[PDB]
Structure 1
Amino acid sequence: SGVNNTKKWKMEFDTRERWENPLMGWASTADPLSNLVLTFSTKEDAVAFAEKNGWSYDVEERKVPKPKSKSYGANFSWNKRTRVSTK
């Protein structure tokens, strides 16, 4: 339930091939950016960084949970379906 990992903007790159090392079976890669993940305060900072470095990018708008209406009393409604059968 913690939300502390959803505060900042990230920049990652497209995933590329990983294959099995013949000797050990370890995951090998030829992608030097496979682990590169950058952090930004705002999407404008992230876009600016991407533009000056020549990378083409996709921007996904931040999803924020919408305000919910909560009422403990609704659990015991006289004539509404919200009444709970167990506690």
Structure 2
Amino acid sequence: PLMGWASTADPLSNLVLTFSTKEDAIAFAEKNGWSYDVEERKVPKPKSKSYGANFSWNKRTRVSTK
């Protein structure tokens, strides 16, 4: 109420712990006591694209611009 800042009563608000595997993450979280929510890893899906398919003859995949 004097400067327009965001104070907090949260010492733990600026923790982050970058790990390398989900197993050690869950093991450390269960080791140190508190609860935890696991979200699963999502890779980009591999696709099938080609420039010749962008220059189709009777397929509708057509670049239409260039």
TM-score (norm 1): 0.73
Identical-pair percentage: 98
Structure 1 Cα separation of the partners of residues 31 and 54 of structure 2? 55
Structure 2 Cα separation of the partners of residues 66 and 35 of structure 1? 32
Q: Classify the secondary structure of the residue corresponding to 1:33.
A: helix
> What residue number does 1:37 align with?
16
Task: Report the CA distance between 1:35 and its aligned residue.
Answer: 0.5
For residues 4-35 of structure 1, the C-alpha deviation after alignment (integer angstroms, 9 at most, x for no partner) is xxxxxxxxxxxxxxxxxx00011101111111
Please, which runs of 5 or more residues in structure 1 have no aligned partner? 1-21
Q: Which has the higher strand share?
A: 1
TM-score (norm 2): 0.94
Task: Report the CA distance between 1:83 and its aligned residue.
Answer: 1.1
- RMSD over aligned Cα atoms: 0.7
Structure 2 Cα separation of the partners of residues 75 and 66 of structure 1? 20
- The higher relative CO (CA closer than 8 Å, separation ≥ 6) is in 1
Q: Which 4+ stretches in 1 moved above 2 angstroms?
A: none
For residues 35-84 of structure 1, the C-alpha deviation after alignment (integer angstroms, 9 at most, x for no partner) is 10001110101101100110100101101011111111111100011011
Aligned length: 66
